[PDB]
Design an enzyme around this catalytic site. Structure first.
Site, mmCIF file in Angstrom:
data_model
loop_
_atom_site.group_PDB
_atom_site.id
_atom_site.type_symbol
_atom_site.label_atom_id
_atom_site.label_comp_id
_atom_site.label_asym_id
_atom_site.label_seq_id
_atom_site.Cartn_x
_atom_site.Cartn_y
_atom_site.Cartn_z
ATOM 1 N N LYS A 143 0.823 -1.206 0.000
ATOM 2 C CA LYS A 143 0.000 0.000 0.000
ATOM 3 C C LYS A 143 0.860 1.259 0.000
ATOM 4 O O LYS A 143 0.553 2.227 -0.706
ATOM 5 C CB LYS A 143 -0.937 -0.006 1.208
ATOM 6 C CG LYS A 143 -1.808 -1.247 1.315
ATOM 7 C CD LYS A 143 -2.734 -1.377 0.113
ATOM 8 C CE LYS A 143 -3.565 -0.118 -0.086
ATOM 9 N NZ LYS A 143 -4.517 -0.253 -1.220
ATOM 10 N N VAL A 167 -11.326 -2.363 8.053
ATOM 11 C CA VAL A 167 -12.677 -2.060 7.603
ATOM 12 C C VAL A 167 -13.605 -3.182 8.044
ATOM 13 O O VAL A 167 -13.445 -4.332 7.623
ATOM 14 C CB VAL A 167 -12.719 -1.868 6.081
ATOM 15 C CG1 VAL A 167 -14.128 -1.605 5.625
ATOM 16 C CG2 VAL A 167 -11.819 -0.718 5.672
#
Ligand SMILES: NC(=O)c1ccc[n+]([C@@H]2O[C@H](COP(=O)([O-])OP(=O)(O)OC[C@H]3O[C@@H](n4cnc5c(N)ncnc54)[C@H](OP(=O)(O)O)[C@@H]3O)[C@@H](O)[C@H]2O)c1
Length: 342
Positions: free
Chosen positions: A168, A198
């Site tokens: 990322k 999440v």
């Protein structure tokens, strides 16, 4: 006025597509294979939705075919395709290479074929590219929208989690590098979304399967764990609700104040036991069918790890985040309701 979203079959992206369709957008999603496209089109059952086939983002020029056929009509791009696989066999190939190459392929396709057409790009980065994985339980560290994961290519492959965070980080680096150097060549403005862990319900109930996406499989695995399973109580990480993430993505290309912004999406610290506590608190008729409750967690005594300064993000997004108890509860209810237990 069309919206293209890469990796449109994922956990987060399926909520993004719903939000785009709720606002009557024309959406073009990319998925790996035809059968995935066939199932998704049936699920949404929306005339404004179509899918193009991109089987592998790591591979040269994966996104030219789309901008070949659809360039004239695509105004916004949401680059959400990136691997979330904490059981990856080959860390480079399975995490780092697809993350970087997928981002490079997407931006070069825009530059080659829609340089004056696409207006905004919203890239799904991660909290992982802002946080320091070695200092998550460090209360002296404060993270904001300008902080960067200090990981290097040398020490990126410590384990599968540091490799994912590096994928990322390195992918977001290339995106901003592309923007700074092609500022006069391309028209679009870049916005990056940085969600933490999440959680939240799957966009479709039938997608509640035996094994869920990685982060939601944390909740699912705990929900079906034996009663005597050890659950950790120390500070784990930050969370964010998937419905908040999907909403932030759409605002990412509608609001001018989000241009050139990194948006840090966190709404609280947690441990795996704090998640388990929601099972016992909200569904007490099933106590004993999962690990027991224990209020003696790091969170409950004020220990929350590294400090999150995302006031700038919350101000710019201007909508309230979903609290932890509701996020876990909606996740758990969907699974238990699907199983016919509540
Ligand atoms: N979950 C989190 O906590 C979290 C936090 C921060 C950021 N994010 C970011 O949010 C995005 C979505 O995450 P998620 O939790 O929704 O993961 P997910 O459910 O596994 O979705 C990932 C999506 O990207 C596609 N994809 C991945 N690697 C690919 C490749 N090499 N070639 C083509 N397509 C590929 C997947 O397609 P297939 O399934 O067909 O491979 C899937 O549609 C990711 O970019 C992730 O980095 C997630």
């Amino acid at each position: 006025m069309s919206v293209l979203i890469s990796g449109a079959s994922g956990y987060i992206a399926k909520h993004i597509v719903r939000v785009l369709l709720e606002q009557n957008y024309k959406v073009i999603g990319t998925v790996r294979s035809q059968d995935i496209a066939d199932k998704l089109l049936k699920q949404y059952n929306n005339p404004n939705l179509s899918y193009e086939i991109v089987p592998e983002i790591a591979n040269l020029d994966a996104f030219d075919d789309i901008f070949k056929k659809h360039g004239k009509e695509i105004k916004y791009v949401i680059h959400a395709a990136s691997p979330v696989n904490f059981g990856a066999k080959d860390l480079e190939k399975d995490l780092v290479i697809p993350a970087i190459n997928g981002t490079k392929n997407m931006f070069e396709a825009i530059k080659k074929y829609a340089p004056d057409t696409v207006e905004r790009v919203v890239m799904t980065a991660s909290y992982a590219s802002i946080m320091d994985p070695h200092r998550q339980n460090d209360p002296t560290l404060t993270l904001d929208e300008e902080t960067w994961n200090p990981v290097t290519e040398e020490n990126a492959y410590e384990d599968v989690f540091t490799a994912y965070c590096a994928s990322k980080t390195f992918a977001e680096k290339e995106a901003w590098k592309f923007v700074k150097e092609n500022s006069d060549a391309v028209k679009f403005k870049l916005t990056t979304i940085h969600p933490s862990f999440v959680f939240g319900p799957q966009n479709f109930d039938e997608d509640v399967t035996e094994k869920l996406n990685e982060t939601c499989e944390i909740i699912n695995g705990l929900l079906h764990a034996p009663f005597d399973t050890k659950v950790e109580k120390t500070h784990f990480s930050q969370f964010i609700d998937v419905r908040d993430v999907a909403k932030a993505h759409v605002l990412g290309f509608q609001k001018d104040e989000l241009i050139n912004q990194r948006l840090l999406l966190c709404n609280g610290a947690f441990s795996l036991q704090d998640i388990v506590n929601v099972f016992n608190e909200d569904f007490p008729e099933l106590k004993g069918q999962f690990p027991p409750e224990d209020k003696d967690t790091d969170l409950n005594k004020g220990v929350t790890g590294c400090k999150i300064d995302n006031e700038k993000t919350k101000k710019l997004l201007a909508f309230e985040f979903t609290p932890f108890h509701k996020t876990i509860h909606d996740t758990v209810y969907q699974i238990l309701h699907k199983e016919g237990r509540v």
